[model samples]
Target: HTTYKLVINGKTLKGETTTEPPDTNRDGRVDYKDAEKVFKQYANDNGVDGEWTYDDATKTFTVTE
Candidate 1:
């Protein structure tokens, strides 16, 4: 799942994060990139449920076993 921690500084201090693991800085998708894209709270970057584990009951997601 996508989550955030209070960091000291940001890449583009003016730049912000979003729910979707966007092409940040024109970077590629890492599946793990959610950590950088998500800023507000914990979330699931399911990528259409193809690359991660998802649970409807808990509203959770995982990138590994």
Candidate 2:
């Protein structure tokens, strides 16, 4: 379980999901691939622009126009 945030053009939105995706890189953990999946889903639901980047150092997702 992880708490996540999606930043849309500098505004911060927060939410969480329990569903898990398969290990993309074979690190034996959910890692950023899983995080990206959730972040992108939330971003698309809100209609974001540009690219979605996951910052492991900060544990946040950001997007900008």
Candidate 3:
């Protein structure tokens, strides 16, 4: 299995993966839902000065302020 990490404003959100599949509608397979969940979990915020960056090689998001 593949693993990924998310960093927001220099602080890590614990677990966030850009390569994951989203099954929001749950069609027994990966779909947009999974992607939406990842976005929701790491939604950008001005308070924390958050910004998102993706590493295609690693398939991860490194969020920073």
Candidate 4:
């Protein structure tokens, strides 16, 4: 387990995380602001590959192959 401190949507919350994880937005505690993290992470993954288009409104990432 490792420590996590997060301030999200303007709230300060902190905790420890156990396991490799994904808990975006709900039914959760201590807040990695996990869901909030996903969109940028999703896009970030696509972007670094040197070819991708990201749609913020849809939270979608696409690449031309």
Candidate 5:
């Protein structure tokens, strides 16, 4: 898998995948279930001060603080 740096406000806060396709909430080995596990861990900051944005164009993820 390709790893992409998550940057926001000109700062790189975290890193994420650039090819995580939508899973529609299905529970597959590495589908929505796996995404949920990771999402849950970071849910507290989903859209908070330290938020992440998914770029569909580049299939990248950016985090802002």
Candidate 6:
């Protein structure tokens, strides 16, 4: 399990999931696709949208609308 941070319009949303996201593409490895799945859900849950980017160094997903 891991904790993911979603930053939307200067607001930070922190969450941790007990189960990891599924590999929707069946690529055999978790990548941006899976990460974005979670990120998108995070944004949708918060009623935010627009452009998004992930930072591996900080483990943060930033969304700007």
Per-residue alpha-carbon lDDT of candidate 1 for residues 1-65, written as tens digits (9 for 90 to 100):
23323222322232223344555556444343354335323323322212234444533444321
Worst 10 residues of 3 by lDDT: 40-49
Listed per candidate, the RMSD to the true structure in angstroms reads 13.7, 4.6, 5.5, 14.4, 6.6, 4.6
| lDDT at position 50, candidate 5 | 58
Q: What is the C-alpha lDDT of each candidate?
A: 0.35, 0.61, 0.50, 0.34, 0.44, 0.62
Question: Is 1 or 2 the stronger prediction by lDDT?
Answer: 2
Q: In model 4, which runs have C-alpha deviations exceeding 4 angstroms?
A: 1-21, 24-50
lDDT of 5 by residue, 6-51 (tens): 4444243444432343445463324433443455355345442455
For each candidate in turn, the TM-score is 0.23, 0.54, 0.41, 0.26, 0.33, 0.53
Per candidate, the number of residue pairs that clash is 0, 0, 4, 1, 0, 0
**lDDT leader:** 6
lDDT by residue for model 2 (1-65), tens:
44556666633544433335565567666665666777677667866556567678867776765
Model 3 over residues 1-65: C-alpha lDDT tens digits?
23445545556444333445544555665533355345555564323335666667755556564
Best by TM-score: 2
Work out candidate 5's RMSD over C-alphas: 6.6
Instruction: Assess candidate 5 and give its TM-score to the true structure.
Output: 0.33
Residue 53 shift from truth in candidate 4, angstroms: 1.5
- Supply the global lDDT for candidate 2: 0.61
Q: After superposition, how far is residue 36 of candidate 6 from its true place, in Å?
A: 2.6
Q: What TM-score does prediction 1 earn?
A: 0.23
lDDT of 6 by residue, 1-65 (tens): 34556666634544333225665667666655566687777667766666778788966777765
Order candidates by TM-score, high to low.
2, 6, 3, 5, 4, 1
Between candidates 1 and 6, the one scoring higher on lDDT is: 6
lDDT over C-alpha atoms for residue 51 of model 2: 56
